[PDB]
Amino acid sequence: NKCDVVVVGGGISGMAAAKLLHDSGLNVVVLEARDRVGGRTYTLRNQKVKYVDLGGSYVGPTQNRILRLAKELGLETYKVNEVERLIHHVKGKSYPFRGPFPPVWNPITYLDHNNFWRTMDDMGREIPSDAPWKAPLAEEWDNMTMKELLDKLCWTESAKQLATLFVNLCVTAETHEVSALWFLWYVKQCGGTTRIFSTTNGGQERKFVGGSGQVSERIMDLLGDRVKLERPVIYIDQTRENVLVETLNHEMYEAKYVISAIPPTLGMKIHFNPPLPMMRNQMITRVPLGSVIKCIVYYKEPFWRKKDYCGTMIIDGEEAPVAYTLDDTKPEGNYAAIMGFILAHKARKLARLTKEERLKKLCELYAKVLGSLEALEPVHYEEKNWCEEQYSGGCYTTYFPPGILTQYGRVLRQPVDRIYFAGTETATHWSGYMEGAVEAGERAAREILHAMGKIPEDEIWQSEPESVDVPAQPITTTFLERHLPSVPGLLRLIGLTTI
Amino acid sequence: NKCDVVVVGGGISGMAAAKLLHDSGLNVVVLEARDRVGGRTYTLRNQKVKYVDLGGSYVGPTQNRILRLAKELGLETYKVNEVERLIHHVKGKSYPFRGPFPPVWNPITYLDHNNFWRTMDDMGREIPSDAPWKAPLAEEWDNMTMKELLDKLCWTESAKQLATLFVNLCVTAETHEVSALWFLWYVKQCGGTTRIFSTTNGGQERKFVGGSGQVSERIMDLLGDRVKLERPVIYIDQTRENVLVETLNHEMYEAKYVISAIPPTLGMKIHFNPPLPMMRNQMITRVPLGSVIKCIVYYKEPFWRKKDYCGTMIIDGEEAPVAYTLDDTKPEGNYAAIMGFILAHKARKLARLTKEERLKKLCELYAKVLGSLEALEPVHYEEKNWCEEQYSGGCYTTYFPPGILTQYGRVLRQPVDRIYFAGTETATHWSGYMEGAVEAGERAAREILHAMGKIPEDEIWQSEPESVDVPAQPITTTFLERHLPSVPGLLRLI
Numbered sequence: 001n002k003c004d005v006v007v008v009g010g011g012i013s014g015m016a017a018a019k020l021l022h023d024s025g026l027n028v029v030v031l032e033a034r035d036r037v038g039g040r041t042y043t044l045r046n047q048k049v050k051y052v053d054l055g056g057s058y059v060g061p062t063q064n065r066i067l068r069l070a071k072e073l074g075l076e077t078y079k080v081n082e083v084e085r086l087i088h089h090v091k092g093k094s095y096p097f098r099g100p101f102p103p104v105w106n107p108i109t110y111l112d113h114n115n116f117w118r119t120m121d122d123m124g125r126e127i128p129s130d131a132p133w134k135a136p137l138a139e140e141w142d143n144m145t146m147k148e149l150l151d152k153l154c155w156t157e158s159a160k161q162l163a164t165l166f167v168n169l170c171v172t173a174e175t176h177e178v179s180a181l182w183f184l185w186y187v188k189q190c191g192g193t194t195r196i197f198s199t200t201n202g203g204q205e206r207k208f209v210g211g212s213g214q215v216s217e218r219i220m221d222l223l224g225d226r227v228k229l230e231r232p233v234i235y236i237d238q239t240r241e242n243v244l245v246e247t248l249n250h251e252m253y254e255a256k257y258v259i260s261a262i263p264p265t266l267g268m269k270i271h272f273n274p275p276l277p278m279m280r281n282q283m284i285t286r287v288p289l290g291s292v293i294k295c296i297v298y299y300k301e302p303f304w305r306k307k308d309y310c311g312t313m314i315i316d317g318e319e320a321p322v323a324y325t326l327d328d329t330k331p332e333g334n335y336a337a338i339m340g341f342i343l344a345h346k347a348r349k350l351a352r353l354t355k356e357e358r359l360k361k362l363c364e365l366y367a368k369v370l371g372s373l374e375a376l377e378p379v380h381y382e383e384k385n386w387c388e389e390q391y392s393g394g395c396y397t398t399y400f401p402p403g404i405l406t407q408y409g410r411v412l413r414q415p416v417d418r419i420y421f422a423g424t425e426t427a428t429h430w431s432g433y434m435e436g437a438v439e440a441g442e443r444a445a446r447e448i449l450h451a452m453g454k455i456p457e458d459e460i461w462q463s464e465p466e467s468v469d470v471p472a473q474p475i476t477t478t479f480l481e482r483h484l485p486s487v488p489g490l491l492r493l494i495g496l497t498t499i
Numbered sequence: 500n501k502c503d504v505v506v507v508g509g510g511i512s513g514m515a516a517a518k519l520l521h522d523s524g525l526n527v528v529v530l531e532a533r534d535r536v537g538g539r540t541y542t543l544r545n546q547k548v549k550y551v552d553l554g555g556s557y558v559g560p561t562q563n564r565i566l567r568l569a570k571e572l573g574l575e576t577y578k579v580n581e582v583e584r585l586i587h588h589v590k591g592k593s594y595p596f597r598g599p600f601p602p603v604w605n606p607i608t609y610l611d612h613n614n615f616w617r618t619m620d621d622m623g624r625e626i627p628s629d630a631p632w633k634a635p636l637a638e639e640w641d642n643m644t645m646k647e648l649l650d651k652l653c654w655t656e657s658a659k660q661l662a663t664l665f666v667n668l669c670v671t672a673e674t675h676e677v678s679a680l681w682f683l684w685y686v687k688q689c690g691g692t693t694r695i696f697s698t699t700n701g702g703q704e705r706k707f708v709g710g711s712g713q714v715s716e717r718i719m720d721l722l723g724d725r726v727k728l729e730r731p732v733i734y735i736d737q738t739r740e741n742v743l744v745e746t747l748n749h750e751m752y753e754a755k756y757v758i759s760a761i762p763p764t765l766g767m768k769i770h771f772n773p774p775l776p777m778m779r780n781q782m783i784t785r786v787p788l789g790s791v792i793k794c795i796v797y798y799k800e801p802f803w804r805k806k807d808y809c810g811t812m813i814i815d816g817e818e819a820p821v822a823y824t825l826d827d828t829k830p831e832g833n834y835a836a837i838m839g840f841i842l843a844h845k846a847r848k849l850a851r852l853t854k855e856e857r858l859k860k861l862c863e864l865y866a867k868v869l870g871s872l873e874a875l876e877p878v879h880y881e882e883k884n885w886c887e888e889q890y891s892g893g894c895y896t897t898y899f900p901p902g903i904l905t906q907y908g909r910v911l912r913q914p915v916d917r918i919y920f921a922g923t924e925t926a927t928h929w930s931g932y933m934e935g936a937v938e939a940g941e942r943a944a945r946e947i948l949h950a951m952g953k954i955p956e957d958e959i960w961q962s963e964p965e966s967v968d969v970p971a972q973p974i975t976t977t978f979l980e981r982h983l984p985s986v987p988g989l990l991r992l993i
């Protein structure tokens with residue numbers, strides 16, 4: 001019934017918010033729709049796998065908030081296997097390599113690839129992390145899809161194909177589905193193309209020992225009966241002195257303030273009194289989440305390592321069900337496994353198949369890419385299609401179609417009377433990730449602390465000390481990478497010398 | 500509590516469905532979230548205006564279902580004033596004209612305009628009304644915005660500016676917001692560019708005497724206490740023998756079947772047990788409605804008629820708050836008024852202003868375009884911003900951003916166990932309109948009748964006899980319109 005703050009949603013963001021408020025001495029309640037906490041993180045435990053992250057899993061350098069929170073809860077990380085060679089599989093052939101991006105030998109194609117990544121980052125530098133709609137060319141960039149941008153920038157099919165995979169992998173959506181401004185912001189706010197795409201020194205460097213679901217679980221343990229499971233919020237009433245929050249199972253909660261820690265579009269599942277202001281009312285119908293099936297195929301041994309492959313496969317082409325894999329073997333070297341994503345339209349296309357049918361297609365793909373018959377001999381399989389989740393809407397995160405971010409972006413984390421907004425989508429650094437969830441949850445909590453006069457305004461947004469355990473190497477470029485011309489750049493140089 | 504069919508939503512679609520089922524002998528209940536019926540139609544009555552449609556208003560030839568339903572309910576239509584000249588206002592100057600489309604005089608510009616409308620209709624002919632995702636180039640066209648298409652097709656800024664206005668006006672959305680496939684389907688399923696854009700012989704030909712809100716109101720009168728107002732549906736449970744429907748005000752309804760007659764995205768406001776199938780689960784997060792403020796400025800007299808203007812203004816440019824107007828004067832000639840739309844991004848931009856501030860901007864615009872100081876002397880003003888409506892989500896209708904229609908379009912009216920889907924968004928002819936609302940409501944009702952074994956399969960989709968009161972003249976083209984080359988076509992000949 002009565003408390004200081006109701007937190008709607010018991011994912012990492014809601015849990016981080018609730019913990020901060022609880023630690024500050026306030027009475028909090030977490031209303032969680034599901035019979036579990038963790039939301040878009042979910043760690044399955046059984047005999048065959050020990051544990052496996054079926055949702056959010058990876059953490060890395062510069063994600064200091066999630067690392068600090070997890071450390072405080074008694075969790076440890078381990079490094080994803082990247083000892084051996086990565087594979088780029090292109091036009092039915094595998095090309096082993098080292099470093100974050102597949103090397104390109106053709107001088108024209110090399111110029112094109114170099115210019116693509118460089119230009120993505122160049123454009124990103126013009127986009128404020130906390131206000132992407134303030135970019136000088138915000139409207140121009142927001143009014144085109146990533147497909148249009150790639151069509152303009154990529155003078156080779158090779159670059160366009162890799163760039164397309166990059167988009168599909170980063171935001172589980174098609175290039176034609178997403179705003180160029182939003183995608184450029186998304187990459188920039190993760191630290192750029194290298195940081196977002198890298199395993200070593202990037203977002204995919206590490207996993208939590210025992211699974212990421214432990215973050216939300218351990219906070220629930222701390223909060224005790226303050227977390228209410230199977231309480232989907234249906235109604236928020238702000239017409240009276242205290243905010244009234246009603247759940248589907250016929251309970252009423254009364255609070256001074258509310259934190260909405262759910263994906264923005266899932267705000268639609270709540271009836272509001274008074275109605276939301278126009279901009280938020282429409283915004284929450286304009287912001288879908290992406291589409292992905294996370295699939296883990298288990299083997300007797302990490303046989304790929306014997307062939308000097310680390311387990312990372314970047315797989316181009318429509319026919320391949322999975323475009324990206326990582327070694328998901330336990331740090332001890334057992335429960336050998338390959339994690340793969342079925343992305344965007346393929347998640348829709350292949351969802352119709354049975355689990356056994358998908359397992360077969362994945363094994364046949366992996367056998368081909370790894371050139372290994374051992375890939376046809378899985379011992380176990382786990383998967384999760386996040387498109388089917390009523391209380392997620394998809395994974396990993398919310399994407400913005402063309403035109404939306406400039407028109408509606410401003411209201412994403414704007415308070416509505418006594419409702420404040422958390423959730424990873426409202427973060428300014430690693431939004432879309434567990435890191436962003438922590439940033440947003442703690443920021444929303446501190447907005448309320450400020451509203452209560454408990455902290456000054458300049459304490460709402462708080463910097464985070466760098467992790468001592470996961471230090472961040474800087475992202476560097478070479479002279480040639482910075483100054484080599486683009487393809488049209490080269491053609492202008494030829495135009496000049498010929499004239 | 501117990502009935503045969505629960506209809507969620509008391510707009511025209513839900514009401515049409517409920518009436519059909521009721522008329523067939525079934526026990527129906529309509530659960531309506533608002534304290535009124537009509538949904539995206541709303542007729543305001545007061546002294547100053549008598550009545551005014553603040554939502555959906557216009558009907559026209561080929562919209563035979565809405566015309567038949569309204570007639571049965573005892574309603575009549577009258578013609579929107581198009582006796583005098585239309586105005587195209589371009590680069591700060593008014594150009595009076597007759598016919599549906601503003602004339603172009605520059606020869607290259609003429610070819611460009613001609614080709615644009617023609618090409619829209621040519622492309623539409625390849626798009627099945629009942630399955631736009633089955634167009635031969637469905638994926639290619641769905642993967643580009645209308646902005647990209649216009650950028651390709653329009654060799655003149657003149658054509659591009661008019662084409663942009665056309666998109667903004669038809670679907671209350673920006674060209675860059677919407678799928679080309681979806682928009683081309685949308686136009687085609689209204690009968691093409693001429694039919695959708697025309698007043699005389701098109702979608703804007705007529706209004707209902709006393710307002711369109713009377714359609715939903717009069718069906719409510721027929722149904723009596725079967726219509727439950729202020730019953731927002733929050734929960735649908737299909738795990739048991741009978742479907743359970745719960746409302747926000749703590750009531751439970753039990754039925755054999757449910758009709759969802761709400762905008763697709765508003766399905767999100769309902770918690771489902773068991774959860775929806777994946778495709779619908781994601782679809783209902785991908786389908787926003789457009790943005791519009793409908794504004795009606797009242798005057799002592801229809802003064803524009805004295806200058807041989809009918810009151811229709813097509814107004815190009817970013818600065819103009821309103822891009823399109825029609826004479827909203829009563830058939831009797833009194834309550835003189837101009838109806839204008841503030842469209843898409845302008846609805847967002849100008850919503851911040853006060854009602855009085857918007858009135859001033861509109862009057863000053865109209866004074867300019869009509870070349871009349873009388874426009875500065877309004878006697879009354881009414882407006883409605885549909886973006887603010889929790890239980891609409893916007894107006895006029897749902898649009899599909901790039902990539903959505905091909906990926907998710909198939910599930911729009913696919914039944915979920917015992918839930919059937921009505922609402923104008925599910926129609927195949929004049930989807931987006933009151934006509935589409937009627938088509939979809941009656942079709943959904945007949946799907947349930949078939950499920951109950953009361954009618955055969957071939958009776959689910961039913962043709963409609965042409966209105967005798969509003970006959971449709973065919974859409975015709977001239978030899979030159981058909982065969983004149985595009986701008987690049989002319990360049991190839993050169």
Ligand SMILES: *Cc1cc2c(cc1C)nc1c(=O)[nH]c(=O)nc-1n2C[C@H](O)[C@H](O)[C@H](O)COP(=O)(O)OP(=O)(O)OC[C@H]1O[C@@H](n2cnc3c(N)ncnc32)[C@H](O)[C@@H]1O
Pocket residue numbers: 008009010011012013014031032033034036037038039040041054055056057058059231232233234261262263266269270292293294386391392394395396397422423424425432433434435437
């Ligand atoms: C799904 C997924 C996510 C993911 C990823 C791979 C997949 C398949 N990989 C990641 C990774 O490697 N590293 C990383 O940092 N992130 C990765 N992601 C994304 C990540 O999981 C998310 O960014 C993060 O978990 C989001 O946290 P947040 O707290 O912001 O949101 P949530 O997890 O969705 O929690 C929301 C909770 O709210 C409940 N809910 C929803 N509606 C209601 C109502 N009406 N009432 C009460 N509760 C509600 C949900 O059940 C959920 O628990």
Ligand SMILES: *Cc1cc2c(cc1C)nc1c(=O)[nH]c(=O)nc-1n2C[C@H](O)[C@H](O)[C@H](O)COP(=O)(O)OP(=O)(O)OC[C@H]1O[C@@H](n2cnc3c(N)ncnc32)[C@H](O)[C@@H]1O
Pocket residue numbers: 507508509510511512513530531532533535536537538539540553554555556557558730731732733760761762765768769791792793885890891893894895896921922923924931932933934936
């Ligand atoms: C807004 C608008 C619409 C419009 C237009 C101009 C404006 C400003 N001009 C039109 C015109 O000139 N001619 C025409 O034919 N159409 C025009 N439009 C669109 C037209 O109004 C719509 O196409 C039509 O009204 C749609 O009817 P439909 O029955 O399909 O949908 P609805 O009116 O939105 O009704 C839905 C009802 O459902 C209720 N609702 C919503 N959620 C719930 C829940 N959870 N539980 C119970 N009821 C719910 C809504 O309140 C509504 O009544």
Ligand SMILES: O=C1Nc2ccccc2C1=O
Pocket residue numbers: 057058169170196197203204326
């Ligand atoms: O889970 C993941 N999220 C990502 C985002 C960008 C690149 C790779 C990945 C993953 O493997």
Ligand SMILES: O=C1Nc2ccccc2C1=O
Pocket residue numbers: 556557668669695696702703825
């Ligand atoms: O209400 C309207 N809907 C329309 C659709 C297309 C063109 C004009 C109009 C209107 O005036």
